[PDB]
Each structure stands twice: as C-alpha cells, then as structure tokens.
Amino acid sequence: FVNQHLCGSHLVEALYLVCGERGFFYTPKT
Amino acid sequence: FVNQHLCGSHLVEALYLVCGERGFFYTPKT
Amino acid sequence: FVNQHLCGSHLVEALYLVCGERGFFYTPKT
Amino acid sequence: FVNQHLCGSHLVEALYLVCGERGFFYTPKT
Amino acid sequence: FVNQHLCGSHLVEALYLVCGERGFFYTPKT
Amino acid sequence: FVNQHLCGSHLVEALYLVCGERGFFYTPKT
Amino acid sequence: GIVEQCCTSICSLYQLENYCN
Amino acid sequence: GIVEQCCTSICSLYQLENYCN
Amino acid sequence: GIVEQCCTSICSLYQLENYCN
Amino acid sequence: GIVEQCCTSICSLYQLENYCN
Amino acid sequence: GIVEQCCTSICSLYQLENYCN
Amino acid sequence: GIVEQCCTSICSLYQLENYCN
Ligand SMILES: [Cl-]
Ligand SMILES: [Cl-]
Ligand SMILES: [Zn+2]
Ligand SMILES: [Zn+2]
C-alpha cells in the first residue's frame, strides 16, 4: 500500500476504512 | 443543536467534531 | 463539548452538523 | 461539468467548492 | 483489513487512502 | 465560479464533483 | 428547494452557483 | 447501539458525547 | 467573522450555532 | 466495474489497490 | 501536474476538468 | 500515540490497524 500524513478528521476516516466493523479507538492524548 | 441522521463514515466525522481532543471510541454491532 | 480549529470544508461540515434543518450561512468575507 | 446527485453533507461540500470565498447559504425545507 | 461498502465520493476517498502518492484512476460505468 | 487551493483528499473530492461519470485520473507524480 | 432537488433527483453546478453569496 | 441508531433512526450530539474518551 | 472565530482562532460547537439560520 | 461493485455489493482494499497508477 | 496547478498554486473548477477522462 | 505515528510522522494502513478493536 502506501505511507502518508493522516491528521484530524482524515485520520479518523482512515481508521474507519481500515477497521470498519471491528471498531476502533481514536485517543489523541495517547 | 439538532438531531442527526448519520451513516457510515458520517458518524465518525460527527464523533470527531463532538469529542475533539478527548477522542472517542467507535463500536458498531457485529 | 470541545473547541478546535475548523477551516474550509471542515468548517462547513461542522456548520451542517450543528445547524442541520435550520440551515446556515457561510460568509468568509465576513 | 456533469449533473450531480447530492445528499446530506455532500451537498454542503459541493456548495463550498462551487462558491469559494463568496460563501453560500444552505437552506433546506422544513 | 475489512471489506468495504462504498458509494459516490466515499469510493474516491478510499482510493486516495489506498493509492497514496501513486494516485489512481476513477472509471465508473456509463 | 472560483479559484482556491485544493489538496489531498479535497482535490480528489473536487475531481469527483467536476468529472463524475466521465471519470478522472489523479496522478500526483504528474 | 435545492437541497431536496439535488438529493431526490439531480442538480447542476450552475444551479448550485445560485446559492453563493 | 449508537452506530446503528444514528443510521436507522436519529441521534443527538448529546448521545454522541457519551462515546468520547 | 466565522473564519477568524473558528479557523484562525478556535471555537466551540455552541459558537458555531451563531451562524445558523 | 469496481465503482459499481463497491456500492451495490462489497469490495476489498486489495481490489481497490488494482486502480492505483 | 495537478498538485502544482491546484494545491501548491490555485485552480478553477474549469481547470480541474483537465483531469477528467 | 496515533497522532505522532500517523499525523506528525507518516504511517501505513497496516500501522493504522494497530488502533482497531
Ligand atoms: Cl452517503
Ligand atoms: Cl486540510
Ligand atoms: Zn456520504
Ligand atoms: Zn481536510
């Protein structure tokens, strides 16, 4: 595939794509 | 604020806006 | 909720979320 | 340009692109 | 990765993420 | 219409809008 | 109106342009 | 759950807020 | 305006309600 | 084609990858 | 290319039509 | 975290899978 900068809503859209039904966590504080 | 009708990625976008730096968890059924 | 930087299409997506049926104006010239 | 089929937030995105710095008004029925 | 259900602009977003700097071609029927 | 900076996923969303059924190529390497 | 027309049927960019400020 | 409710029916921003960390 | 309040600076979802009709 | 398959049914990221340049 | 024309510089919706098939 | 790995730096779709449930 590729590696790119994914930030903000773009990051969570990428998480949605990759994880889908599994679900995911977005925890920027870390 | 107004009630929402959100499917797919549109829900993740809404979560992103609502939660901000707190982040969030996306946990669909099955 | 939170406070974040909302710019460009992200800003108008946030306006859509918050205003919905009410509608909204996006007038950057001010 | 081509004709468009735009629902929800997709319409607001199109307005954003079309109007640019002019901005726009989003005014749904009811 | 998980299987995808992607319509309209959501498909173009997925292509963008998948292909990165390689870019891509979007070629719908008719 | 207008002229604006269109980058990344925003660029491909604009291409989708303008080209639609015709399809398009996104070839950043050029 | 425009919001409904674009969704239930189709609309053009030229129609959209009418909603710019 | 929330993911299904927002899509099949409607949901509020206050309901969404429950899913923040 | 909205850009100065929400893009250049930082604004809440409540402040965004200022721009609803 | 891919555009229709992803929407009417499902598609994989590996299928999508075929459309990269 | 498209990035130089539309991202780095600034382009119109008409110029974007250059990249349609 | 995810921001440092994928926004500030650069990450793959595979690395993004690190954040799935
Ligand atoms: Cl949709
Ligand atoms: Cl951006
Ligand atoms: Zn959509
Ligand atoms: Zn963006």
Residues with Cβ within 8 Å of H8's Cβ and at least 6 positions away in sequence, in order, are none
Residue of D nearest to B9 (CA): D9
Q: State the distance between the two ends of chain L, measured CA to CA, in whole angstroms.
A: 16
CA of residue H21 to ligand 3 center, whole Å: 25
Residue C29: HSE in the Cβ half-sphere, 13 Å Cα cutoff: 8
- Which chain B residues contact residue I13 at CB under 8 A? 1, 17-18
- Is the CB of J4 inside 8 Å of chain F's CB atoms? no
Q: What gap in Å lies between CA F20 and CA D3, rounded to an integer?
A: 8
Q: What gap in Å lies between CA K12 and CA F14, rounded to an integer?
A: 10
Token reading at D21: 């710095």
**Following DSSP, what letter does each residue of C1-30 receive, concatenated?**
--EE---THHHHHHHHHHHGGG-EEE-TT-
How far is the CA of L21 from the CAs of A26, G19, J16, in angstroms? 11, 43, 23
Domain assignments of chain C as residue spans, ordered by start:
1-30
Contact in structure between I14 and C1 (CB atoms under 8 Å): yes
Q: To the nearest 10°, the Cα dihedral for E23, E28, F3, F4?
A: -50
Residue closest to F29 by CA, chosen among D1, A2, E9: A2
Query: 3-class SS at I7?
Result: helix
CA of residue E7 to ligand 1 center, whole Å: 7
Q: What gap in Å lies between CA B1 and CA H16, rounded to an integer?
A: 12
Decide if E21 and A2 are in contact by the 8 Å CB cutoff: yes
Chains in contact with L, where contact means 3 or more Cβ–Cβ distances below 8 Å, are A, E
Q: State the distance between the two ends of chain D, measured CA to CA, in whole angstroms.
A: 30
Fill in the DSSP letter of residue L8.
I
Residue of K nearest to F8 (CA): K7
CA of residue B8 to ligand 3 center, whole Å: 7
To what resolution in angstroms was this structure determined? Answer: 1.6
User: Residue D18 belongs to what H/E stretch?
Assistant: helix D9-19
Residues with Cβ within 8 Å of A11's Cβ and at least 6 positions away in sequence, in order, are A26, L2, L3, L6, L7
User: Chain D residues with CB-CB distance to G under 8 A?
Assistant: 1, 3-8, 11, 14-15, 18-20, 22-29
Chains in contact with F, where contact means 3 or more Cβ–Cβ distances below 8 Å, are A, C, D, E, G, J, K
Chains in contact with K, where contact means 3 or more Cβ–Cβ distances below 8 Å, are D, F
- Cα angle I14, F14, I13; round to 5: 5
Contact in structure between F13 and E13 (CB atoms under 8 Å): yes
Residue window 1-30, chain F: list those with CB within 8 Å of chain A.
8-9
Decide if C15 and I16 are in contact by the 8 Å CB cutoff: yes
Q: Where does residue J1 rank: exposed (0-12), middle (13-18), buried (19+ CB within 10 A)?
A: exposed
Residue D26: HSE in the Cβ half-sphere, 13 Å Cα cutoff: 32
Q: What gap in Å lies between CA C8 and CA I7, rounded to an integer?
A: 8
Query: 3-class SS at C21?
Result: helix
Q: Where does residue D11 rank: exposed (0-12), middle (13-18), buried (19+ CB within 10 A)?
A: buried
Q: What gap in Å lies between CA I10 and CA H21, rounded to an integer?
A: 21
* Residue F23 Ramachandran class (φ > 0 left, ψ -120 to 50 alpha, else beta): left
Residues with Cβ within 8 Å of E18's Cβ and at least 6 positions away in sequence, in order, are A1, A2, E24, J13, J16, J17, J20, L13
Q: Read off the amino acid at residue C7.
A: C
Hey, how many other C-beta atoms are within 10 angstroms of the C-beta on G9? 9
Maximum C-alpha span of chain I: 23
Contact in structure between D25 and C25 (CB atoms under 8 Å): yes
How far is the CA of E23 from the CAs of E8, E27, F29, L6, L13, in angstroms? 18, 13, 8, 19, 16
Residue closest to D2 by CA, chosen among L11, E17, F15, C5: F15
Contact in structure between F16 and K15 (CB atoms under 8 Å): no
Contact in structure between F29 and K1 (CB atoms under 8 Å): yes
Rg of the Cα atoms in chain H: 8
Q: What gap in Å lies between CA A9 and CA B12, rounded to an integer?
A: 8
**Following DSSP, what letter does each residue of E1-30 receive, concatenated?**
---B---THHHHHHHHHHHGGG-EEE----
Residue of K nearest to D19 (CA): K13
Contact in structure between I19 and C26 (CB atoms under 8 Å): yes
